[PDB]
Amino acid sequence: PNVLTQVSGPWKTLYVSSNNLDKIGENGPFRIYLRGINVDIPRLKMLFNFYVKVDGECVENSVGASIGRDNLIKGEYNGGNYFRIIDMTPNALIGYDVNVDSKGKITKVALLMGRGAHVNEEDIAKFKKLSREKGIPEENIIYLGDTDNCPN
């Protein structure tokens, strides 16, 4: 699956959206600042490396996930996650997560992640498009590109 091969490496979070504003808001567990992704293609495993602000404090994460059939990435972090890469350019990355907590609540999360700068404005459209498709309100879109004050 072309996309899954090429994704390994550094990433920066540009935009996130969610059906649940609390989740990606200040102190939300999905206010995620990506650092990088590692694909272990033989072992069918992925590693997401990123920071969340936890009580104003930068906390590094390294979350393991498995690549299943039809490329659904599943991994534990703040509950169960069912993750998919929607699209990849060499500059960009669009992800869609479905999160489920212990009480079974469902949080949809869309992410635009960048490789560096000079971000394709067209990419933004594809992102908002996706966000719309998955029933996320346009007001629930947040730009994180300029608040990444965590290490590295």
TrEMBL record:
It is found in: Secreted. One of its GO terms (molecular function) is small molecule binding. Coiled coil: none annotated. Pfam families: Lipocalin. CDD domains: lipocalin_OBP-like (cd19427). One of its GO terms (cellular component) is extracellular region. Residues 8-147 form the Lipocalin/cytosolic fatty-acid binding domain. Disulfide bonds join 58-150. InterPro entries: Calycin, Lipocalin, Lipocln_cytosolic_FA-bd_dom, OBP-like. Its main location: secreted. Keywords: Secreted, Signal. Belongs to the calycin superfamily. Lipocalin family. PANTHER family: LIPOCALIN, ODORANT-BINDING PROTEIN 1A-RELATED. This is Allergen Can f 4.
